[PDB]
Amino acid sequence: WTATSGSCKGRCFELQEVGPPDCRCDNLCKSYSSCCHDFDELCLKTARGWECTKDRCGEVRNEENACHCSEDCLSRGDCCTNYQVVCKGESHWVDDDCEEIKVPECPAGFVRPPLIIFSVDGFRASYMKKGSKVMPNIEKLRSCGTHAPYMRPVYPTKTFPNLYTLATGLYPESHGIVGNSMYDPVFDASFHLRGREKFNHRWWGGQPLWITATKQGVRAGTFFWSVSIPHERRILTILQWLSLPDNERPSVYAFYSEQPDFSGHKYGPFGPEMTNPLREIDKTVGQLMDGLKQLRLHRCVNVIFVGDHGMEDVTCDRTEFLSNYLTNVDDITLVPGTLGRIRAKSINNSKYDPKTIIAALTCKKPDQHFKPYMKQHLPKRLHYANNRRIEDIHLLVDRRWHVARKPLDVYKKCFFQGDHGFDNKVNSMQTVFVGYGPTFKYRTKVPPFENIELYNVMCDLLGLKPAPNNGTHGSLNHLLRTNTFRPTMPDEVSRPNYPGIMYLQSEFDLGCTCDDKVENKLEELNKRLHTKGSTKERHLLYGRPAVLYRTSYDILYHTDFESGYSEIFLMPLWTSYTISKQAEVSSIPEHLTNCVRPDVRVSPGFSQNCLAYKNDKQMSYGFLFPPYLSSSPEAKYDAFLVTNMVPMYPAFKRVWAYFQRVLVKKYASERNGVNVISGPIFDYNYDGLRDTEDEIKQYVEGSSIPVPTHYYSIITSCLDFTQPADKCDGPLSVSSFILPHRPDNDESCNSSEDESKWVEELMKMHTARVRDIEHLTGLDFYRKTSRSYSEILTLKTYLHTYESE
Numbered sequence: 052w053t054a055t056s057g058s059c060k061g062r063c064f065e066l067q068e069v070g071p072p073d074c075r076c077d078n079l080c081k082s083y084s085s086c087c088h089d090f091d092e093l094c095l096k097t098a099r100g101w102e103c104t105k106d107r108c109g110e111v112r113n114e115e116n117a118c119h120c121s122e123d124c125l126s127r128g129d130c131c132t133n134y135q136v137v138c139k140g141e142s143h144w145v146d147d148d149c150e151e152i153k154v155p156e157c158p159a160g161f162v163r164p165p166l167i168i169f170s171v172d173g174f175r176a177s178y179m180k181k182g183s184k185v186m187p188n189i190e191k192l193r194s195c196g197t198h199a200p201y202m203r204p205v206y207p208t209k210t211f212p213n214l215y216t217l218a219t220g221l222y223p224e225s226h227g228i229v230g231n232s233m234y235d236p237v238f239d240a241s242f243h244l245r246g247r248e249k250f251n252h253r254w255w256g257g258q259p260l261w262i263t264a265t266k267q268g269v270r271a272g273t274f275f276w277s278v279s280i281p282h283e284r285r286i287l288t289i290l291q292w293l294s295l296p297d298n299e300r301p302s303v304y305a306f307y308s309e310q311p312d313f314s315g316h317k318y319g320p321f322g323p324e325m326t327n328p329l330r331e332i333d334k335t336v337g338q339l340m341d342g343l344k345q346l347r348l349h350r351c352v353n354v355i356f357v358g359d360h361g362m363e364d365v366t367c368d369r370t371e372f373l374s375n376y377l378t379n380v381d382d383i384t385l386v387p388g389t390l391g392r393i394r395a396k397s398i399n400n401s402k403y404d405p406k407t408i409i410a411a412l413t414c415k416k417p418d419q420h421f422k423p424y425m426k427q428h429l430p431k432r433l434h435y436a437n438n439r440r441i442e443d444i445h446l447l448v449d450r451r452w453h454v455a456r457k458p459l460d461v462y463k464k465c466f467f468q469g470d471h472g473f474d475n476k477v478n479s480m481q482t483v484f485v486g487y488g489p490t491f492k493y494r495t496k497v498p499p500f501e502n503i504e505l506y507n508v509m510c511d512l513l514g515l516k517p518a519p520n521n522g523t524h525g526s527l528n529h530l531l532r533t534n535t536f537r538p539t540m541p542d543e544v545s546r547p548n549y550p551g552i553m554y555l556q557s558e559f560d561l562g563c564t565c566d567d568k569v570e571n572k573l574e575e576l577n578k579r580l581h582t583k584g585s586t587k588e589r590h591l592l593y594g595r596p597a598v599l600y601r602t603s604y605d606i607l608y609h610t611d612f613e614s615g616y617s618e619i620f621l622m623p624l625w626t627s628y629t630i631s632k633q634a635e636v637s638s639i640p641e642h643l644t645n646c647v648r649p650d651v652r653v654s655p656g657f658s659q660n661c662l663a664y665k666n667d668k669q670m671s672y673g674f675l676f677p678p679y680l681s682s683s684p685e686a687k688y689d690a691f692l693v694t695n696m697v698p699m700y701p702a703f704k705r706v707w708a709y710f711q712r713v714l715v716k717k718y719a720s721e722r723n724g725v726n727v728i729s730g731p732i733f734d735y736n737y738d739g740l741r742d743t744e745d746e747i748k749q750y751v752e753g754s755s756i757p758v759p760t761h762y763y764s765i766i767t768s769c770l771d772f773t774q775p776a777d778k779c780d781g782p783l784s785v786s787s788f789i790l791p792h793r794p795d796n797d798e799s800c801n802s803s804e805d806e807s808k809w810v811e812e813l814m815k816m817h818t819a820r821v822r823d824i825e826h827l828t829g830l831d832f833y834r835k836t837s838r839s840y841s842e843i844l845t846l847k848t849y850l851h852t853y854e855s856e
């Protein structure tokens with residue numbers, strides 16, 4: 052109950068919300084149906100529109116008008132945004148030449164440059180170029196400030212998950228807003244875009260920027276807006292707040308536009324109807340910039356122009372129906388559209404079974420336009436599993452398509468021609484980033500980056516300490532003129548042992564055999580040098596990885612590769628080797644096909660054993676450094692050391708063997724040499740973080756050998772490919788992957804075909820950032836390079852997406 056009988060007189064757009072049952076006058080009161088009786092009359096004035104005209108100049112103030120052109124409006128802070136242009140001979144901001152803002156030029160009483168975040172829903176990255184002729188204000192921000200060619204949203208590429216990620220720096224699985232619609236089984240409650248449940252703070256985790264600011268004594272209200280407040284009134288309200296007295300004025304402001312998303316759903320991303328919404332958003336930016344220029348703030352404020360996601364062509368005819376696959380379609384609840392989430396309709400139905408649902412949805416139709424996954428099997432780059440609100444069964448829907456439960460869902464709901472939500476690497480889902488102001492660089496283009504990084508930069512812009520988040524603080528330092536965050540490398544926690552030869556062959560009883568008993572002072576000292584690290588500068592190009600947790604491990608050197616061998620997990624944490632452009636691929640010789648060799652540097656008690664693999668009828672093994680890439684027939688023996696072996700399902704070995712035999716050499720040819728670091732990952736609780744030993748759910752039968760959930764590789768070369776990977780003078784180039792270690796290839800519908808037709812496609816889907824691997828392994832890479840630490844942080848956040856232009 053609201054006592055709407057109170058009044059908004061002197062309170063319009065108050066920043067402190069008042070508590071029930073008292074009526075409200077803040078920018079959210081409409082959403083709650085709680086505005087005072089006179090809020091429209093007092094706070095939503097519209098008389099005479101939003102622009103000054105010649106006849107209004109020097110008018111006698113009339114408090115009914117939406118905005119003012121009287122002589123007193125500048126001191127009242129409530130002129131129409133074009134007042135100085137119409138009445139005082141001034142130019143529009145867009146018509147002024149751009150001039151570098153080398154220092155903030157702020158009025159007295161300003162303690163720091165304010166930050167204004169201007170968020171545009173559904174603003175596809177390519178609009179910046181394709182729409183540039185009709186968006187002169189935005190084009191001036193972009194060209195004069197700092198811009199990326201695109202910014203990558205989080206998955207799912209929906210509004211609320213992305214706007215809340217922008218505000219918190221967190222993945223949706225950690226902030227909790229994991230879709231526009233959600234069921235939380237603990238709350239037993241549902242969240243929707245429409246309605247009031249979403250007002251309850253229990254859904255919204257993390258610490259959004261307005262709260263971070265407020266806790267540290269920087270004034271900031273929430274970034275939400277009631278939809279019925281027109282954009283022109285939102286801009287005027289921002290300009291009015293900026294005219295508050297020093298002690299009352301916020302330092303951070305947010306404008307939100309429901310366009311171009313609204314029209315894009317109706318018309319498609321490039322519908323001819325889309326020009327007008329882009330014009331209208333540009334006009335709104337022009338109002339803000341003109342208004343700042345009136346207030347002498349246009350060379351003081353930092354402005355961020357940022358989108359939440361793009362928009363793809365999607366029509367009702369491109370819908371897959373689960374009723375065409377499942378017999379039991381009435382026993383499931385589907386969250387539908389550009390992604391699918393499936394759970395049981397009734398928790399009382401114990402004949403519901405996810406295994407049979409996944410199987411009924413896997414590769415059933417030749418052109419199938421969605422792929423089912425248990426959430427833990429989704430690509431790790433999506434970071435979309437560790438939340439009870441994310442259903443165990445997920446459908447990744449092809450771009451341009453929808454999934455629905457039954458046909459009647461789609462016509463008892465063609466209306467729409469655009470939609471979004473798909474995989475966040477999809478080109479149509481990319482969105483925009485421009486930063487303009489004293490703290491941003493001048494006329495600077497930066498590489499594409501992810502939106503999870505922006506919270507830290509906004510904290511830097513405001514002098515705030517960010518709450519713990521998923522950005523990598525410092526990775527966007529190259530966007531900023533000043534206020535950079537100079538991170539230090541994390542301290543290594545465990546130092547390695549460097550074992551020498553300490554065991555005789557007969558001390559091992561591993562059940563392994565190798566035909567290696569076939570026998571020189573020149574080449575004995577040489578092999579001894581290799582075991583002491585003489586080739587290490589060739590194969591470990593960027594220093595050894597640092598181990599950032601407590602563990603027991605050994606560094607093992609070899610002619611062709613170096614590894615960090617874990618005495619706890621009985622296998623390497625990492626294996627590093629360089630393959631030059633000139634490297635030759637060879638076979639595993641016949642007599643060495645089943646060869647595994649005890650490593651006389653490592654105790655039998657800390658080694659794997661062949662008998663475990665013989666006995667585990669499900670599990671085979673592979674090697675981290677590939678025998679195919681040995682430098683000589685004699686060095687090849689090192690590749691069959693028990694310390695280079697890792698457990699692999701036979702179905703996974705098809706993938707791994709093709710990567711090692713064919714693709715590494717292909718990359719070395721294309722990139723002019725590559726350095727490869729490969730290793731296992733254990734993430735049985737799917738939290739994106741390294742498992743401790745007591746979290747391992749599966750071992751090689753009858754042994755303490757843990758089975759990885761994934762295998763990674765990080766593939767590094769010189770950005771200037773005229774220089775070989777091992778003699779690189781400048782910046783680096785990287786691609787990485789985190790492949791799921793699965794006992795079938797049900798994910799790859801074409802797996803019955805030769806690996807050349809499906810394996811690289813699998814790998815591309817499971818592309819990763821080095822930072823993703825760092826979280827999953829507790830390792831810190833690139834510790835010894837000639838590059839600045841911020842540049843290396845940017846390199847660790849890079850994702851190779853395999854999308855075209």
Ligand SMILES: *[C@@H]1O[C@H](CO)[C@@H](O[C@@H]2O[C@H](CO)[C@@H](O[C@@H]3O[C@H](CO[C@H]4O[C@H](CO)[C@@H](O)[C@H](O[C@H]5O[C@H](CO)[C@@H](O)[C@H](O)[C@@H]5O[C@H]5O[C@H](CO)[C@@H](O)[C@H](O)[C@@H]5O)[C@@H]4O)[C@@H](O)[C@H](O[C@H]4O[C@H](CO)[C@@H](O)[C@H](O)[C@@H]4O[C@H]4O[C@H](CO)[C@@H](O)[C@H](O)[C@@H]4O)[C@@H]3O)[C@H](O)[C@H]2NC(C)=O)[C@H](O)[C@H]1NC(C)=O
Nearest residue numbers: 224225226227255256257437438439519520521738739826
């Ligand atoms: C992305 O960045 C984020 C932010 O840095 C990373 O997430 C952090 O990761 C930590 C590890 O997973 C996690 O630390 C845990 O915090 C527990 C206290 O949690 C509360 O307090 C914090 C701080 O204010 C708060 O942010 C939390 O918010 C979560 O929960 C609420 C709902 O309750 C949500 O609204 C919110 O969205 C968020 O949910 C997310 O995180 C939780 C886990 O906290 C998930 O369950 C959700 O699905 C969702 O993803 C909380 O309100 C603390 O209790 C933990 O301590 C346990 O483990 C330690 C290890 O040191 C052990 O020593 C302790 O004994 C303890 O164990 C006991 O509890 C166990 C569980 O019941 C039990 O089994 C044992 O037997 C013991 O009794 C732990 O320290 C931190 O909370 C999150 N923060 C956030 C915001 O998500 C994220 O990892 C990054 N991602 C990647 C890929 O890098």
Ligand SMILES: NS(=O)(=O)CCCC(=O)N1CCN(c2ccc3ncn(CC(=O)NCc4ccc(Cl)c(Cl)c4)c(=O)c3c2)CC1
Nearest residue numbers: 079082211214215218249250252255256274275276277307
């Ligand atoms: N973690 S915490 O404890 O600090 C709690 C944080 C959440 C919170 O403060 N509330 C309290 C206020 N609630 C609320 C009330 C009225 C509303 N009226 C309109 N709209 C539409 C809109 O603004 N869309 C654009 C939009 C802009 C920014 C973003 Cl980030 C997002 Cl996602 C969407 C709303 O979303 C809306 C929301 C949400 C929960």
Ligand SMILES: [Ca+2]
Nearest residue numbers: 172173210359
């Ligand atoms: Ca949106």
Ligand SMILES: [Ca+2]
Nearest residue numbers: 734740741742
């Ligand atoms: Ca884990």
Ligand code: NA
Nearest residue numbers: 664667668670
């Ligand atoms: Na076996």
Ligand code: NA
Nearest residue numbers: 796797799802
């Ligand atoms: Na298959």
Ligand SMILES: [Zn+2]
Nearest residue numbers: 173312316471
């Ligand atoms: Zn939308």
